[PDB]
């Protein structure tokens, strides 16, 4: 089997991407944030505290003839941005782009933190990291990809995120029309539960490539590119007036600037992030200070190849017995 679904930016900055997902019988379609940095499929629901729901579409398990309470199971997750959610668990039929999994754990939110309530466009998350990170207790549950894997034509999914435009998540096949050149594959460590890999270096604009190992994660659920402070300083030093602002929470730059590109290495290959992809717009409405799309990971503990980086590539998440990542230009 295969599946193919379009993923759409939630706003004009590409702060996140939503993909329609069918849950239950008859189908209830929710727009979920596909997140290769986590491993829970959770949804706003008829169980979510009413004051914490503000415009999201909810899953109502009592209206699904295929929903079954997973008795005794609870979940609770905290994300790197400080947001969180928790609740109980149903199993139900879940379909993405024509690919169907029966018996998928659908984690129903009883509580969500303010950032989720405040984002009316995201109805929940669909985790695509390794199932070892799934938070369901006392019986850990498998991701949608893990459950689908054996049925897929090939044990892969691909992320093709658009810049200020829709893109595609495919399951079970590699669309050879969706990229240019060849796909360069690179080793993955699953030891922390992430799609963790080592970039071979970077360049700023037209500058020379610096060969240096940068361990990080391919994370579709993180907006920006978080890299070591040395790398990030070298990038922003090429932008007149750019500075790190403790009050804003990162590097800012004059909105009048034209940003240089940023290149990262994948083996001997190179992925070029155009400068425009690094512009996240005014820090507050009407400001002439703009927020940078490359930020320091120093306070995180891990480097994160988020959407800023991934959207410059066609990315293969290869879930073969030994997982690997592939990157192609597009």
From Swiss-Prot:
Q: What is its EC number?
A: 3.4.23.22
Cysteine disulfide links: 255-290
Catalysed conversion reaction = Hydrolysis of proteins with specificity similar to that of pepsin A, prefers hydrophobic residues at P1 and P1', but does not cleave 14-Ala-|-Leu-15 in the B chain of insulin or Z-Glu-Tyr. Clots milk
Top-level EC class: hydrolase
Q: Name one GO molecular function term.
A: aspartic-type endopeptidase activity
Q: Where is the Peptidase A1 domain?
A: 17-328
What residues sit in the active site?
35, 199
The answer to whether keyword Hydrolase applies is yes
Keyword annotations for this protein, in alphabetical order, are: Aspartyl protease, Disulfide bond, Hydrolase, Protease, Signal, Zymogen
- Superkingdom, taxonomy of origin: Eukaryota
**GO biological process entries:** proteolysis
* Similarity remark: Belongs to the peptidase A1 family.
**Could you identify this protein by its name?**
Endothiapepsin
Look up and give the organism this protein is from.
Cryphonectria parasitica (Chestnut blight fungus)
Lineage start: Eukaryota, Fungi, Dikarya, Ascomycota, Pezizomycotina
Q: Which gene encodes it?
A: EAPA
Portion of the full sequence shown: 90 to 419 of 419
């Amino acid at each position: 089997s295969t599946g193919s679904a379009t993923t759409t930016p939630i706003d004009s900055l590409d702060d996140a991407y939503i993909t329609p997902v069918q849950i239950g019988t008859p189908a209830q379609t929710l727009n979920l944030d596909f997140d290769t940095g986590s491993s829970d499929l959770w949804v706003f629901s008829s169980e979510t505290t009413a004051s914490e729901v503000d415009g999201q579409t909810i899953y109502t398990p009592s209206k699904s003839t295929t929903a079954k309470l997973l008795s005794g199971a609870t979940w609770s997750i905290s994300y790197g941005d400080g947001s969180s959610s928790s609740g109980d668990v149903y199993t139900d039929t879940v379909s993405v782009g024509g690919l169907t999994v029966t018996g998928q754990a659908v984690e129903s939110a009883k509580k969500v933190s303010s950032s989720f309530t405040e984002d009316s466009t995201i109805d929940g998350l669909l985790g695509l990291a390794f199932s070892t990170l799934n938070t369901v207790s006392p019986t850990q549950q498998k991701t949608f990809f893990d459950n689908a894997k054996a049925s897929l034509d090939s044990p892969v999914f691909t992320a093709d995120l658009g810049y200020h435009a829709p893109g595609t998540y495919n399951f079970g096949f590699i669309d050879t029309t969706a990229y240019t050149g060849s796909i360069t594959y690179t080793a993955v460590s699953t030891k922390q539960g992430f799609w963790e890999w080592t970039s071979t270096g970077y360049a700023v604009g037209s500058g020379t490539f610096k060969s240096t190992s940068i361990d990080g994660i391919a994370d579709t659920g993180t907006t920006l590119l978080y890299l070591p402070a040395t790398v990030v300083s070298a990038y922003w030093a090429q932008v007149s007036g750019a500075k790190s602002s403790s009050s804003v929470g990162g590097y800012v730059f004059p909105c009048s600037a034209t940003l240089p590109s940023f290149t990262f290495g994948v083996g001997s290959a190179r992925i070029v992030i155009p400068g425009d992809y690094i512009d996240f717009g005014p820090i507050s409405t009407g400001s002439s200070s703009c927020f940078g799309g490359i930020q320091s990971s120093a306070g995180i503990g891990i480097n994160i190849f988020g959407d800023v980086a991934l959207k410059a590539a066609f990315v293969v998440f290869n879930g073969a017995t030994t997982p690997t990542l592939g990157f192609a230009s597009k």
